[PDB]
Every structure is written in C-alpha cells, then in structure tokens.
From a paper:
Importantly, the absence of uL22 was consistently observed in most identified precursors (states: 1-8), implying a systematic effect of [name] on ribosome assembly. Quantification of uL22 and uL29 incorporation revealed a frequent absence of uL22, observed in ~46.4% of all precursors. The absence of uL22 and bL32 in several states of the [name] dataset also led to the absence of uL2 in eight precursor states (states 1-8), suggesting a possible role of uL2 as a checkpoint protein, whose binding completes a construction phase.
Numbering used by the authors:
A (entry chain K): 1 to 122
B (entry chain D): 1 to 126, 161 to 209
C (entry chain G): 1 to 176
D (entry chain 4): 1 to 38
The structure:
Amino acid sequence: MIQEQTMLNVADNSGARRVMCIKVLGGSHRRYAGVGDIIKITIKEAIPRGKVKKGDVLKAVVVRTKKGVRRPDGSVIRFDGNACVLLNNNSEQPIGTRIFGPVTRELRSEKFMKIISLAPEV
Amino acid sequence: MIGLVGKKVGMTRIFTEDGVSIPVTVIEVEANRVTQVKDLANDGYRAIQVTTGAKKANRVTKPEAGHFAKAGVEAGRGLWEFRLAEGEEFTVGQSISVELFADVKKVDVTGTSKGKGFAGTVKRWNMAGQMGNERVTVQSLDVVRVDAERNLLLVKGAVPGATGSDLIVKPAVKA
Amino acid sequence: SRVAKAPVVVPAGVDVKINGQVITIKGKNGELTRTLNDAVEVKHADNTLTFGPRDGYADGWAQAGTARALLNSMVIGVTEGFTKKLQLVGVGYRAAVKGNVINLSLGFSHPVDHQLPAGITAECPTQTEIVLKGADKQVIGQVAADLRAYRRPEPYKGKGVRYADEVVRTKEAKKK
Amino acid sequence: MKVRASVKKLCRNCKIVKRDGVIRVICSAEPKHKQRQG
RNA sequence: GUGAAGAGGGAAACAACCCAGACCGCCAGCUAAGGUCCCAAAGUCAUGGUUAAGUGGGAAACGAUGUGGGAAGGCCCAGACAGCCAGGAUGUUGGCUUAGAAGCAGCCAUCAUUUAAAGAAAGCGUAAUAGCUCACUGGUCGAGUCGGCCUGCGCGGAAGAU
RNA sequence: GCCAGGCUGUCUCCACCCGAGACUCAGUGAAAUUGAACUCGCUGUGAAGAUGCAGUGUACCCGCGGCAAGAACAGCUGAUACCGCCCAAGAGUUCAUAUCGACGGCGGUGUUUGGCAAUGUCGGCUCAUCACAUCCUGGGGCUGAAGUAGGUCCCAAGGGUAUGGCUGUUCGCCAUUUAAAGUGGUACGCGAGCUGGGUUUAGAACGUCGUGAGACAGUUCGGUCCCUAUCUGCCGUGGGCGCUGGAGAACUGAGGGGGGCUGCUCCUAGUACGAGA
RNA sequence: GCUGAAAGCAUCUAAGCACGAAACUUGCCCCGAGAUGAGUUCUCCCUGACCCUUUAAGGGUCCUGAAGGAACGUUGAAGAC
C-alpha cells in the first residue's frame, strides 16, 4: 500500500537510492495506489555520473508492497518494505536490467510483458 | 419467482477445485409449508403465506393455534408473504424445499442488521440515531452450493443479521 | 371551403356508413373506419358525399374540406387501395425482410428490426433504392419512420444505397 | 437559431407559421433564416 | 383633508386611497363607496360588441402579416388570385482580360426572325457542358383575389420574486 | 541565529480498550429569564424577513436522548456603472447576423462611482437550501459540419462541479488532475455553531489632534466572542386514546427516505467506406 | 417522418398517421392505514341472573374473569430509560 508522500525503495541498477512520491495517478480523486498502478516520484540521492540526475520528476511503478496483496486462495504476499522502479512516459523499457528481490504474478499486464523475464528469483 | 425464509448460522470459506477461496454464508432453510393463499377475488392480490420453525403449544397464542389448525399444519415461529409473478400457483400445506434455488444462480437476501447504540453524526452520516433493526436488502448474490438433503444454502459475501437471525432469500429480480 | 364544396363520387363496390359522427368505409381492400369531427354534418347523398358544415362552428368549412379530401381518398382506396399511398424501402445495407420483421444493419453494430404493424405487401424488386405500393392501406401508418430514424442514407456519404427502387440525395464524405 | 423579438421575411422563401402560439419563420432554401420568437 | 385627537365599512391585510363624523338599547327598514360562483350576502340577470390567449389576474418605448369594421386602391364571367396536362425552339461555344464562363462572376450592348409567345436572361448544379424551373403565351374548371392605413383587443416587446 | 537526520494517530481514516460525567433507581437541590399564551411551514403587506394581520397547506394529546438550523457594518432617487434586447453599416473567398459585428434606440439592476439625509460588520471550517440566467454528464437546431474534435443557439438542476505557493482576503496569478473544478439569492447564508487572520465591543501599544478627559477607514499584540436554547423546528423512541364486542398475526397501500457517477482496455475493428489522408 | 393536397409542383399535419434523449416518470431498494378517508384477510374468546329509575347510546346488585396483555425471574449478538 502506497499513499501521498510515501518512502519507496529502489529495485534497479539505475543508481537511485532514495525516491520520494509527489503525486498519485490512476483514478480521479484517488487517495491510494496499488502495486499495479502508476505513481509520480522524484529522486533524493543520485550516483556521481549516470543517466539519472537530481531533481528529475518521472513516473514509476511499485513492485513490492509492505502491506501486500491478497490471493484467490487466501494467501498473502508481504515484504519488509516498499520497492518501486522508475518508469518513463516514453521508452517504457526501464534502464535497469536487474531487479533486486522477487516479484509477484500480477505483472502480466500488456505493458509489463518485458519485465517478467527479469527477476530470476521468482 | 418466490423466495423462502431461512435462519442465518454462520459464514466461512469454500475452496474450489482450482484453488480459489470464496466466502459462503450458511443459511438453514427448513421446508416452509404454505398456510394460507391470497387471491385477487378475495384478498385483492395473489400471494402465499409460508411458515417455518416450531413453537411450543404452551407458547402459542390460541388464535395462532386455531389459524394453524385450519391449515392442518404444525405451528411455526412466524409467517411471511411472497408475491407471485403471475406463474404457477400453490396449495395450502405444500411444503417448499431449497430445490427451487438449485437452478437460479442469482439470489437476493433481506434481513435485519445487528442492532447498535446511538451513532454520532460523524459515525452515521460521515442525524445521529439508533442504527440496526431495520429491513435491508442486498441483491445480486450468487448461490455457491445447495444441499437439498440437509436444508443448507450458501451464498457469496455477507448477509444482514447476526448468528441465528432470520432472513429471506428471493430470486434475483435484476439480471 | 373550396375543398368542402366538392361532392366526391363513390363508385360501385364501396359501402359508406354514417353513424352520426362515425364514418365507416368498406370495399375491396377491406374495412375502414374514421371518427369524423363533430363540426361537419356530411350528408350521405348516395353516389356522393356532399359536405355541409353544421351552423355554429367557425372551423366548419375547413373541417368539411378536410373530411372531403381523405374521405374521397379512402373511398377510391377501398375500391382500388390507398390511391394516395406508396412506400419507399430497400434500405441500402445488408438486410432482408420476412414475416412481419424487416431485418436491417443500418450503420450499427447490432441488427435493428422494425415491427411490421400486422400486414404488409413486402417486396424486393431491386437491391437498394426508393419504392413501394398502396395495397397495405391503413397499416402503412409511417412504417418508414423507423427505417429513416435509424439512418436516412446520411446526406453526406451515401454509405449504403437508398431503398426499394428510386433515388435519394447525398453530398461528399470524409469519415467512415 | 435566432430568438429575436421581431421576425421578418429575409428572403422570398420564408413562410410565417403560428405553432403553439409562437410565430415562427420557416425557410426551405437556407435553414439559417429560421427564427423562433415572432 | 386625513392621522395627531374619529369610531365603522370597502380596497384580501394596511396610518396618510374611497364612503362616512360613533348619546345609549332594539333579532326593524332604506342608502353612500364596494359587491351580487362559492368561500362570505346578494342576478350563474336581459340586450348590444371584444376575447381562444387564463392577456383578464403587472409592466413602458419601439417594429409586422387576426379576426369585427371604416376610408378606400389594383386586377376581375371581351372571366382575376393560386394555378400548369403544352411551349420556352435558333446563332448568343460572342467579340471582350481568347486559360471557359456560353445568362447562372464581371467590362457590355441590353439587337434581331417563327410568332397564339419567349428574354442576346431570375434560381438549383456542373472545371464551363448539359439538364429542371420562372417571366409570358395555348386549353379546362372558376368566380372572386392581392398589397398598405386606421384601429379596441389576441401578439411581440415580456424576463420577477424560496 | 540556520541546516540534515531519527523521532508520535496532527492528518489520508481513524480502529479498539480502563476510569470520571453523560442515562435509570432512592433522597438533597438554585439561578440567569418571565405581561399573558390553546407558542406550525409558505406567499403577500407591515417602523421594511411576522408563531399573533389576509390567503394557503400540514399536523392525534404528553414525554425522553440528541446535532444547535433559529458617525462606524447592515431609508428615498438612479446621472454614473453593469446586464439583456431591437435596428444595423461591415468583416467573413460572393452573403449582415455559421462566427463577430461599428453608429444608433430600448428596457431591468441596485452588483461601482453617485444625489437627499446591544441588529456583533470581511474571511476560513462544519452544515446546507433554491432559479438556470448550464461548467460538465449532455441531446437537439445552424455551421464557413467533404469528421471525433468542435464554432454558435432551445431544453435539461436528475446528479457531479479539486489539490498546493502569494492575500486576512472576496477576487486574481501560478503548477498538477479531472467531466467540469459554474453564475447568483439565502442580513454580499451560516459567530446564543467553530478561530479570529485586518478591520469594527471592552485593554493596552506607536505617530498625529487638543492644556485637559478623549478621537483618528493613520498601524501592530492578543481579544470573556456575553445571553440553563426558556422556547421554535427536525432524527430516533415511548405513555394515553380512537378506529365501535375484545384480542393475536399476515399484508394491499394514499403518502413519504435517500442513490440513478465514471476512467482504461478488449473482441467488434485498422470496421462504413473513403481518390487518398 | 409513408402518401399528400388545399394551391395537377411542393410542404411535419389539414387528413389515414409511427419512431425517438440517459431530459421526465415508473421500474430498483426502505418507512408507511393517527391515511381520523382511521384499510383488507385468517383465527381465537365471551351464549349468567336479579332489582330500581328521571324508561333509555339508563343505573345498581350477586356470580363469572374467557382469549390476550401486563406484573415478576433468567436473560440476548435488543437496549440511555
């Protein structure tokens, strides 16, 4: 579960360490966003040299949720924290070719066909 | 068409073959025999009075005892009415089982919500007053399993009323 | 006034009954009734239907002419079949007619069916162009109103050609 | 369309019709000349 | 003049609007303003006219085309208004800014034979062609018809208050 | 005096638990106020928002727990100013009104400037009511509509009609979403409902006026935000009575309560056909 | 909008005469016969006697106490009472 001004971790090799959420999209007058929802985040720390620079504002998607998600059989997926990966409006293919931690099975969306290959640990 | 009155027992989960957990609310549906028939000529409309349960002879008022005797059936715990849909009629003493709901796949549940004390304006409207103990209906519910030999009924979700509360299940008007 | 002062010849084979204001016309095509206005006291006048408005009505002459016109039309219809009638239909898209239903695909994703009001001499001489007939007399009330309401070969693109046998207009197309 | 207080025959092909107590102008050449309130 | 310092009735209520100056009592009669469908007492009263819109029952200046009527005016059984089964034929594919304007864009005349009759041209559409109508002219029915002024009211104007 | 970080229901949203009151039983018990009351809503008038005047509609009599809806600011006239309209030169490839529309006239407004001469006043929060004179869901007409999108007009109030930085701000500017982030009346709604951000009850502070107390639409600080809301109105629930001998149930129903929202994709379908786009 | 004249063309209408916007109302859910216009149906219970008067919607006396409710106890996922 993610709300306005929520701390999200980093699960890509883009060099980001801390990312802050500024706006929530995916529904008019919406107060919360899910794992399979788009959010607007910024960057707090950046590597010395790289493609990502301080002050950039861009889309992102949560891959792991502290609250977790439910399953039809009653099973629940819970993580130690919230992990988010930055996404761009154009060239949706994220720069990060490696993802830390496992992923769930809800990434079968039309736009998430290229991310299922990554994250070998499920 | 016509619904039946049952008793709420509890709710749990039912696992499908594919491995999906589905909530189910347990309703005991005793064979609700018909006591009286109302018609357009006499009563002004077509309806049937159904009864369920069983009351002790010492705990049944003599007028009710005579009314049940006229129908030639044992005295139940209450009477309920269901409007006919201009379809087949019924006869007094015709026991009705849960087999009717075995091929509907869509049911609506009416009942009284659990009583509660006074709820403030923020708690109620989000004027403050007592909540619960009023008729409320939740429609478009799908029956999961039907057990004719055990007088059991299971529907998805939750239904008004606590354990042991009487409720009414009717075929889903909306479709 | 001018229409009222015009006796209408009723040929053989047509029966006219004047039950007060009620006018009943029978003939080869079939029965026909039309409750006439109370402001006209038309005389039977066998072999004619001479119209004379009742005194005390300002609208008497116009009502008498209104009567005369369609009373003559009804007479020469019951003798031959709605002299003053047609229809227009074969509707320019994939379509068909059967029983009392004309199945159509007028520019929609679902079929649109117009109920035929219990009687029609449907035909399809050519594919799609304007025509029809008189035999249906009173059952032809509108009928084509539903056909045109769904679509009236939109007068820009002509996407689907007109009706039974004759023509309709259109002018230029951009989007399909 | 025009809802002005006064309606006049702008062109030859204008007809005055009193419908529902309203004097309208109907034109068979250009619909633009159609005005409602007379 | 009223109220101040005059009661009472009417205008639905109301002090400056109308009638009207209370000595007291009567279960008597007649009037003023205002009414005579009820509420609430009186004509669902007589005659002569307007009203088709609840305008009456709220509204000004300013502009037309409804009936009732007045002054009249034009064309009218040597037959009018609306009408059209009939005609609209020929160079005038024009010189002219030749890119085609040919009447349907303009410089331009705005002619001339058939003639019971037709213009070198008013609308619809074509790159212009072409084609369909109208000015007028043959034939039948046919009697009235057309444009403005005066107006009382119907109307616009006009949109009024939980 | 400043920065970075860890740190709690201050909030998205509040969820639940322990005590003291709130409610009942037994007894003690006073006040603010009080002309008398058999103390309803709406329209109209009124020294001008009427429980008491004319009209209209509803309501069986009496209790209980409740949210609190109950000179400075707010008379006569309308030059000024705003609003709508009529005519209409013209722009618009020809064509005034598809869209604008110059010069003119006509009315309405008290939404500016104006002329005469203890009713607590602008904001923000809670709570809302009503007209469309409609921002949207909109359909329907014209289009210069060879199309969604649209440019303009008739109707629609059934419903919806934002978040943050500058102001106390109404308003306005800015950035991001949405279908839009509407116009106005309700003492420019709502302080005996909530705070007072400046102004404008009582205190005091700075500059000015007067010897003086005092005063300043000259400017800050905070500011009893007074009135046992008796009573008016409403949600819920009771005691009495009548439905005509009495009683227990099941219901038809005159009327009444509130909601009729919506994004994305899918197959249809790269579909109608369209010179192609 | 099919035909369509009046007014040999034409026109939504004059006449034979139908569709249609999510706009409006029903339809969807709940309270509701104090709706004093006080509604409909089923069942149950009472089938005594005497006296007087101002002689009739009269009064009193002895017996009777029907069904049902209330009274009190256990109490409830019903409840401030």
